[PDB]
Structure 1
Amino acid sequence: MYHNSSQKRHWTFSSEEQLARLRADANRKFRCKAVANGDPVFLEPHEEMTLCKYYEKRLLEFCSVFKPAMPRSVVGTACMYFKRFYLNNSVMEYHPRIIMLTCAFLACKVDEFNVSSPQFVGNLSPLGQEKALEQILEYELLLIQQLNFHLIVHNPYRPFEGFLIDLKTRYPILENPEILRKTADDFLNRIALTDAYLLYTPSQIALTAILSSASRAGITMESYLSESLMLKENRTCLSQLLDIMKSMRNLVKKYEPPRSEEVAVLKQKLERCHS
């Protein structure tokens, strides 16, 4: 369960400033190591963040076309592994393509989505396929180590379903909660692009998506929080809940997708770095 999980204990950070500090530390550490081995080729932390965003989108598009069809939990786990791994490491030390392939491999193994190695590499020239399998096998344990052996990832999909059941049962003011589903799902996807997975609990994310979809439709469910969730007894908790949801919404608002030409330039820079 989430309330006593390793994700809550070690992988939920107070603010975006902590995340920026960790990523800057990883970048500076790699720069120091490279200069100790023996200047305009190193990537600034924001460029690394842009490259990580692009490769997360690439991993999403890889998982969407996977055969047999990947469940949503496996994709969420892989994306969380990607974010966690590059929180403490630098792209110029490990290529994000191999890293995201390894993240998907590890997620499939962890989430009990049984596929053999040949099936996994078939979703990618055969020679490149065996090379990719070799690199994935090489990087699996490094990825596990950089995750501190915290492998179970809690996703917002089951909390979303639970919220829908609760709304259908105890909220007759809303006629048919099912119409809230599709739009909310879209919002969830937007949440997955931002940094909110490392800052909020899955239940908070699911509730934010649901209430944002409801507000887009012109329905207000302030009573659902105040009455159904019994929050009128503790007004302070309701206040923090609204502030958390507003912070998530602002985080989605401020998100800027990677630009194609900038991504190409930075891809050339990173390829030179790994060369």
Structure 2
Amino acid sequence: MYHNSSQKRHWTFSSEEQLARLRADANRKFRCKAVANGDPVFLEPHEEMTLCKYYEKRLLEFCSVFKPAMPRSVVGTACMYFKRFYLNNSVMEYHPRIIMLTCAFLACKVDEFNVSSPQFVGNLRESPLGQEKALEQILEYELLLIQQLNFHLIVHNPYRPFEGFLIDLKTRYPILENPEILRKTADDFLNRIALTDAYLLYTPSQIALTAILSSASRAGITMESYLSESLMLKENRTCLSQLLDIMKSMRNLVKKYEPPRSEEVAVLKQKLERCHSAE
């Protein structure tokens, strides 16, 4: 359950500044390690973030065409693994190309989605020798990924809270006739929400409700009476204000999201490849 989960306890952070602090600390730690081992080679934390966003989208693409059809919970778990790993790890130490595949592999194991390793590597668009080497690398990195998650493998995704909210709307909010039409847009918002750092800053229930009410607002449907009446927030004024502020901040997070620019992505990918080959 989320309310006593490790995700709530250790992987929900106070602000974007805290996440930036962690990522900058990881970047500087790799810089110090590389200098001690024996500069323009290194990537800046914003370049690390651009590469991480690009490779998270690559992870989404890998999980989208994965055969057999990977459940959405597994995909969300894998993306959360990717975000958590690169919170405290540099892409220059561990390549995101292999780390994302290891995230998908571990998520498939953790979310009880049974796929054999040959079946997993068959989903890559490479020669079988490349698939064998990729499987080897994934096996090398699986325990490392598990350790870097602090052995917190259960990920609470917004999808089941979203379904529960839809049930509650269909039950206790008759004025929202046919809440199902709010699904797709909300789902779309969910996808966009997943691109940001929201999953590290907000509860799955808050994310699901924010998506639902953003979809409702986009539909010309005003339903904070759901919050005040059905959720009994008319009593605790501060609770309703805090929930509204949380949803506003999450919508702002979605607003100020810029996808990685492919022209910048090529330069950063070449820089990262030089980082890995040189070390």
TM bin, normalised by shorter chain, reads: over 0.9
TM-score by length of 2: 0.98
Residue of structure 2 equivalent to 1:129: 131
Matched residue of 2:169: which SS? helix
Q: Partner of 1:112 in structure 2?
A: 112
Superposed CA deviations along residues 234-260 of structure 1, whole A, max 9, x for unmatched, are 000000000000000000000000001
Cα-to-partner distance string for 1:186-213 (whole Å, 9 max, x where unaligned): 0000000000000000000000000000
List per-residue Cα deviations over 1:19-58 (Å, max 9, x = no partner): 0000000000000011111111100000000000000000
CA distance in 2, matches of 1:9, 1:61: 30
Per-residue deviation at 1:93? Answer: 0.2
* Equivalences for residues 8-27 of structure 1 within 5 A: 8-27=8-27
- What is the DSSP-based 3-state SS (H/G/I as helix, E as strand, rest coil) of the residue aligned with 2:115? coil
Instruction: Give the deviation of 1:218 after TM superposition.
Output: 0.4
Give me the whole-angstrom Cα distance separating, in 2, the residues matched to 1:176 and 1:197. 28
> Residue in 1 aligned with 2:170?
168
Once the two structures are TM-superposed, the CA of residue 66 in structure 1 deviates from its matched residue by 0.3
Cα drift, residue 263 of structure 1 = 0.2
Shift of 1:118: 0.5
Q: Give 3-state SS (helix, strand or coil) of 2:179's partner.
A: coil
Q: Please give the alpha-carbon distance, in whole angstroms, between the structure 2 residues aligned to 1:134 and 1:223.
A: 55
Q: Aligned to 1:166, what secondary structure does the other structure show?
A: helix
Paired residue secondary structure (1:178): helix
1:50-69 deviations in whole A, cap 9, x for unaligned? 00000000000010000000
Counterpart-to-counterpart distance in 1, 2:184 and 2:64: 18
CA distance in 2: counterparts of 1:50 and 1:221, whole angstroms: 37
Per-residue deviation at 1:123?
Answer: 0.5
Q: Secondary structure at the match of 1:66?
A: coil
- Which residue of structure 1 aligns with residue 7 of structure 2? 7
CA distance in structure 2 between the partners assigned to 1:49 and 1:28 by the alignment: 14
Q: Deviations over 1:93-115 (max 9, x none)?
A: 00000000000000000000000
Describe the SS at the equivalent of 1:158.
helix
Q: Report the TM-score when normalising by structure 1.
A: 1.00
**Alpha-carbon distance in 2 for matches of 1:135, 1:197:** 27
Q: Return the offset for 1:222.
A: 1.1
1:206 & 1:42 partners in 2: Cα distance?
Answer: 38
For the residues of structure 2 that align with 1:205 and 1:185, how far apart are their CA atoms? 11
* Aligned counterpart, 2:65: 65
Distance in structure 2 (CA, Å) of the matches to 1:146 and 1:187: 29
Q: Any gaps of 5 or more consecutive residues in structure 2?
A: none
In the other structure, the counterpart of 1:49 is 49
1:208 & 1:6 partners in 2: Cα distance? Answer: 22
Alpha-carbon offset, residue 91 of structure 1:
0.3
What pairs up with 1:131-170 in 2 under 5 angstroms?
Answer: 131-170=133-172
Structure 1 moving runs of 4+ over 6 Å: none
Over aligned residues, Cα RMSD in angstroms?
0.4
Q: What CA distance in whole angstroms lies between the structure 1 residues aligned with 2:11 and 2:181? A: 33
* 1:203 aligned residue: 205
Alignment of 1:206-221 (within 5 A): 206-221=208-223
Name the CA distance, whole Å, in 2 between partners of 1:78 and 1:61. Answer: 12
Tell me the CA shift for residue 5 of structure 1.
0.5
Q: 1:128 and 1:183 mapped to 2: Cα distance?
A: 39
Deviation of 1:158 after TM superposition, in Å, equals: 0.2
Q: Where in structure 1 are there 5+ consecutive unaligned residues?
A: none
After superposition, the C-alpha distances for 1:216-241 in whole angstroms (9 at most, x for unaligned) are 00000010000000000100000000
**Shift of the alpha carbon at 1:270?**
0.2
Q: How far off is 1:13 after superposition?
A: 0.5
Report how far residue 150 of structure 1 moved. 0.4
CA displacement 1:132-164 (0-9 Å, x = unmatched): 000000000000000000000000000000000
Determine the C-alpha separation between the residues in 1 that align with 2:263 and 2:161: 38
**Residue 90 (structure 1) shift:** 0.3
2:80 aligned with 1:80: yes
Percent of residue pairs identical:
100
- Further displaced range: 32-41 or 75-84: 32-41
SS in 1 for 2:139: helix
In 2, distance between residues paired with 1:23 and 1:190? 21
Distance in 2 between residues matched to 1:114 and 1:178, nearest whole Å: 31
